Structure formats: C-alpha cells, structure tokens
Amino acid sequence: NLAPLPPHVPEHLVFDFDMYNPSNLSAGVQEAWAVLQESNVPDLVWTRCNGGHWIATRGQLIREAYEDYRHFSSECPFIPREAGEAYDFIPTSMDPPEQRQFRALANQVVGMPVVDKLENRIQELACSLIESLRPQGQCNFTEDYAEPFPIRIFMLLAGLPEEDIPHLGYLTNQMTRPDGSMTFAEAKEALYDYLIPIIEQRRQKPGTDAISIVANGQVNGRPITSDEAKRMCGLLLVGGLDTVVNFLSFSMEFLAKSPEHRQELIERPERIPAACEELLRRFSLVADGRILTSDYEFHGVQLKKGDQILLPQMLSGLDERENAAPMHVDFSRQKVSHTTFGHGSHLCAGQHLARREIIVTLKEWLTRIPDFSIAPGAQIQHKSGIVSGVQALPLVWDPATTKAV
Ligand code: HEM
Ligand SMILES: CC1(C)[C@@H]2CC[C@@]1(C)C(=O)C2
Ligand SMILES: [K+]
Ligand SMILES: [K+]
C-alpha cells in the first residue's frame, strides 16, 4: 500500500519501510528497524509507506535534525500526516522559543523533584507487586508488572483513580500502536473528554497532584488556559502509560534469557544505573519526527517544505557508528551512546522518573526472583509504532529459588 513517489524524490533513495509493521518483526522490533542500517540502505531514505515520508537512519543525522528546529518543526511530529496534524500536545507540538515556558511546568510535575517526592512509593509498589508474584512461579509480565507498576505510580502522581487505567491505557495505545479501530483524532478526543471535567474540577479546587499543578500553573505571565492544561495533561498521560510500560517488557525479556547479566547486577548493584543505560540503548523503542518548514538540502538530499521526516530515536544507539557491536548488551561499555529519551529542546522531561522506575525494577526483581526464564515454547511478539511494545511476556520460575526480603 504505497503512496505515489513525489517528483522530487530520486528512486535510489526509496526504501519502503513500514514503521507500524516492519518486515522483520519476528526477529525482534529493534532488529526489524536495524535493517535500515544495512549497507544497501542510504543514510537518508524515503519510504512510500504510510503516506510517504523520509527516515534518517544514522545517529548523526537524527541528532542534527532534532537540534535544528528551524527546518525540522515539531508542529506535525507524528506519522502518518493525519496523526501529526491532529497531534496538539504541549510542549511537544511546539518549537522553541514557544516551547520554553510550558517545559518548565512539565518539569515541575514529572521531573526530578517529583521523583524525589515519590521515591518511597515507587520502591514500595515495586516490592509489593513483586513479592505478590514471587510464590506463583509464573506471571504474564506485561499485565502483571509492566503495566500496573508505572501506571499506578502515574495515576498516584496525577491523583487519578486506578479504576480508569484499562480505559486510559487503551486510548493511549491507540496513539502509539493504532488498532485501526480508531483514528489518532478519535483517540485524542476520547482522552480529552476524560480530562476536561477533571481539569475544571481542579482549577476550582486546587490539589497537590500533577493535574492540579499544571491546570493552575503560569505561562507567559498569565494563567494557563483550560485548553492548554488539557493538551499538556494529555501528553503526561501518554508518557505515563505508554513508555516505561513497554520498555520494561523488552528488558525483562532480555534478562529472562541471560543468567550472567542477571548475576552481574545482583553481585554489584552499583552497576545497575549503567546497566539501565545500556538496556535503554539496546531496547530503545521510540520513533517520532518532524516536518520541514521550508525546502532544504540536508546532507545532499533535497527535502521539500511540508515533507515529513521520521527521526527514529531508537536508531541512534543501534548505529554501529556510535556503538560497536550494537546488538550486544554490554554493561561495561565505556560510553553508552543513545538518544532513547530524544534530543534537542524536546529531550524527555520525564526521564528521571523513567530511570528510577527501571533501576528499582531491576534491583527489586533480581533480589527476589534472580532465576527465571521465558515460558517453554512461548513465542514473544513485538509490535511497532511511535512507541514499540511487547504483546505478552510469559515468564516462569521455580519458587524454591526465589526469596522474600
Ligand atoms: C522509557 C521511557 C521513556 C522514553 C523512552 C521517552 C521518550 C521520549 C522522547 C523520545 C521524547 C521527545 C519526543 C520529541 O522530541 O518529539 C519525550 C518527550 C517527553 N516525555 Fe518522555 N519518555 C519516557 C518516559 C516518560 C515518562 C514516564 C513521562 C512522564 C509523564 C514522560 C514525559 C515526557 C514529556 C512531558 C515530554 C515532552 C518534553 C518537551 O516536549 O519539552 N516521558 N519522551
Ligand atoms: C513520542 C513520545 C514518546 C514522547 C512522550 C510520549 C510520546 C508518545 C509523545 O507524544 C512525546
Ligand atoms: K542507512
Ligand atoms: K499538529
């Protein structure tokens, strides 16, 4: 299902990669995307899939483009174009300098200070979920930990009821890995109709939750509007429910297959942060992009005003030009080069929360359940989109080899 090749695109640059269903998905999603970095593929290519768009395949190009917001605007950051145009989240649908005052407020609510605020709840919940699973000797990790652990901490941070998780998660999934059951526009308006009354309630009677803080915050000297508060809160939801949730499954799938990597962390837990970095590199999972604000020649390639370009955050750290043996997980890498949390002005505002959830998960899981594996004969299926994911991760273990703390 290819869109007609636009007249300005040389055919030697054509490579029909489908970011929502890559040909090589069975081998793993990161492997499926890494075909873009084989010798037969140029640095910057055009796919006719999903409406037609560019893809930069090298970390150097991806970083350069994310840095140069003048040519590569965030106004339409999603593929396909209908999704990008509908996408109005704050601050991600804005360029500098407009982005600035909204970013400060985002950081107030999901940045470092809030991690330090919630540290104990994060630790408490991980221990609680894991201890509860430990004597079963089995679990479906996606639904049993990967989802409830980060999502409940986010609902806690946002003061929203856990009753709304299955609903919210669904709409959020629709914006990252669409079912086809609803357009991006449908999903957004569903999420907005959920948020709107809550925000109004909380502008009238301010709480201490993230939503109250955003909705009563200040930008450009004035009160934030109800619409703006909604557009920021919408993004916070997506980040809360469809990032770390997916990442945790990739990591745990890997660890289920590598006993030596597990023991490495169990014996020297001070290496856990560096290991988190490496896993974030190897199992990077995000791919959005930008839109050309004008005709622009970029590394020898003529880009036209209005062209969309996908700038896969996932690819930079997999680029062999940035990391030798990129598909190998190596906790001792002197430098873990990646752009897993993005690059430029829109660098992830929630990355400290994310790292915290990852590091707590690694430590607390391996403490109690050091020895586990994927269920016998189970086939693990990855899914691809703006944020990549795992359909299910059946794990098994002998409870005799586990340990309560
Ligand atoms: C493994 C976990 C995560 C990954 C890989 C990730 C990745 C990213 C990336 C690549 C961007 C930049 C998008 C762009 O440049 O267009 C971004 C932005 C953002 N993310 Fe994260 N994210 C994660 C977790 C979270 C969490 C838990 C939150 C909490 C709500 C969050 C909140 C945000 C916000 C608010 C922005 C916008 C910052 C701005 O536009 O100035 N993220 N994220
Ligand atoms: C691309 C992202 C990972 C980043 C945070 C959530 C996400 C889906 C966005 O809309 C911005
Ligand atoms: K390439
Ligand atoms: K838009």
From Swiss-Prot:
Entry cofactors? heme
Key word Zinc present? no
Where found, per UniProt?
A: Cytoplasm
> Which species is this UniProt entry from?
Pseudomonas putida (Arthrobacter siderocapsulatus)
Q: What is this protein called?
A: Camphor 5-monooxygenase
Pathway assigned to this chain's UniProt record? Terpene metabolism; (R)-camphor degradation
The region annotated as signal peptide is: none
EC annotation?
1.14.15.1
Q: Which UniProt keywords apply?
A: Cytoplasm, Heme, Iron, Metal-binding, Monooxygenase, Oxidoreductase
CDD domains in the record: P450cam-like
Q: Which reaction does it catalyse?
A: 2 reduced [2Fe-2S]-[putidaredoxin] + (1R,4R)-camphor + O2 + 2 H(+) = (1R,4R,5R)-5-hydroxycamphor + 2 oxidized [2Fe-2S]-[putidaredoxin] + H2O
Q: GO cellular component annotations, sorted alphabetically?
A: cytoplasm
